[PDB]
Amino acid sequence: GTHWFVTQRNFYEPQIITTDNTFVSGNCDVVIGIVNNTVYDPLQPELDS
Amino acid sequence: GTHWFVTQRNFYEPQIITTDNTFVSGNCDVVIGIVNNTVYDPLQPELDS
Numbered sequence A, B: 001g002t003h004w005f006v007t008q009r010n011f012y013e014p015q016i017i018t019t020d021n022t023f024v025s026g027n028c029d030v031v032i033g034i035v036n037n038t039v040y041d042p043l044q045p046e047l048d049s
Ligand SMILES: *[C@@H]1O[C@H](CO)[C@@H](O)[C@H](O)[C@H]1NC(C)=O
Pocket: A035, A036
């Protein structure tokens, strides 16, 4: 309703949208119905130790 | 002709060969027809920067 998750199609198991749950292909002007949100990189938070 | 890419088998959508599109198993000794190239590591630019 407010947040976006990625889930398997046959069972609602919401997951945080990461760069390892998704793949990048193209630009943000060709997909009809695309939305804005943040893709969490699992590596940025821990590289700054 | 000069570069090496990895595509999906049914549609020509070339991508740069990285450590995300490929998996390692073995060495350059047993595979008949293996070709030298470079495998881009996404971790290096982010770690060096
Ligand atoms: C948000 O989406 C709009 C269109 O839906 C787009 O023009 C814009 O670049 C996106 N990102 C931001 C930060 O507004």
